[PDB]
Amino acid sequence: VHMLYINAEVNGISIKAFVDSGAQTTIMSKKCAEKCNLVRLIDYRFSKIVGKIHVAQMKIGNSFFPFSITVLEESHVDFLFGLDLLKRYQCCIDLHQNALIIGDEKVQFLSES
Amino acid sequence: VHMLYINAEVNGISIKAFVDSGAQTTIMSKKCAEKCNLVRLIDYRFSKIVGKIHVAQMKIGNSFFPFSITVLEESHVDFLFGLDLLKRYQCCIDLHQNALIIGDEKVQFLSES
């Protein structure tokens, strides 16, 4: 079984978000943080946790959401969309249509490609 | 944020299933395996993995599904409903209604209680 991913822009960068209902908090790898020019945003008063990003822009389809990220030193996925965000947006994970419903957007999960 | 749980009977025992789209495989703790009289079912040709249960009965609402379990020595959750099962049943995680749609069943997630 392939994991669940959607396309998203975080702070205007196109990435692949691993959708994970078993995760309390949306998180991102330090390597991904670099790749999105987000290192400057990092509040280092948090801390293996690199830090916290209080405000970042999520672009999903043609919708825009503020969200927070926790940056980890090393992580298996680069970007992990968590339950925090899922519950906040009363998103629907429909594995019948194979898409994520988040407000007026319906975004398909990617195939292994 | 509270995690996602539903009520289910596995092999006629009432339990609380942690719903987790970020998990490839449905798994169960060794302690939970004991608590469901499932230790006998365990194929020890697998192995920290205690073993694999090839066939177990899931009762969700008034529906019945065969499923496999991987038994782990120690685990944070006791029973974890995975993507394997979610994708297999084209289940829908609706955090708008706060329920799991799996065929003709719609089961509510539990509150912190």
Numbering used by the authors:
A (entry chain A), B (entry chain A): 201 to 247, 257 to 322
The authors write:
Ddi1 is a multidomain protein that belongs to the ubiquitin receptor family of proteins. The Ddi1 proteins contain a highly conserved retroviral protease (RVP)-like domain along with other domains. The crystal structures of the RVP domains of Ddi1 from T. gondii and C. hominis were determined; they form homodimers similar to those observed in HIV protease and the reported structures of the same domain from Saccharomyces cerevisiae, Leishmania major and humans. The ubiquitin receptor family of proteins bind to ubiquitinated substrates through the UBA domain and deliver the substrates to the proteasome by interacting with the regulatory subunit of the 26S proteasome through the UBL domain.
The structure of CrypDdi1-RVP was determined by molecular replacement using the ToxoDdi1-RVP structure as the search model which has 61% sequence identity with ToxoDdi1-RVP. The solution had one molecule in the ASU with TFZ and LLG of 29 and 899, respectively, in the space group H32. The electron density corresponding to the flap region was missing. Similarly in the CrypDdi1-RVP structure, the side chains of residues Met203, Tyr205, Phe218, Ala223, Ile227, Ile258, Thr279, Leu281, Val286 and Leu289 form a hydrophobic binding cavity. The cavity in ToxoDdi1-RVP is larger than that formed in HIV protease which has a width of ∼19–22 ​Å in the open form, while the size of the cavity in CrypDdi1-RVP is comparable to that of HIV protease. Of all the inhibitors tested, nelfinavir showed binding to ToxoDdi1-RVP with a Kd of 237.6 ​± ​6.3 ​μM and saquinavir showed binding to CrypDdi1-RVP with a Kd of 242.1 ​± ​3 ​μM. Saquinavir docked to CrypDdi1-RVP with a binding energy of −6.5 ​kcal/mol in a similar manner as observed in the crystal structure of the complex of HIV protease with saquinavir. While the presence of HDD and the similarities in the structures and the active site architecture suggest that ToxoDdi1-RVP may have the capability to cleave ubiquitin and the substrates upon polyubiquitination similar to the yeastDdi1, in the case of CrypDdi1-RVP as the HDD domain is missing, the triggering mechanism has to be different and is yet to be investigated.
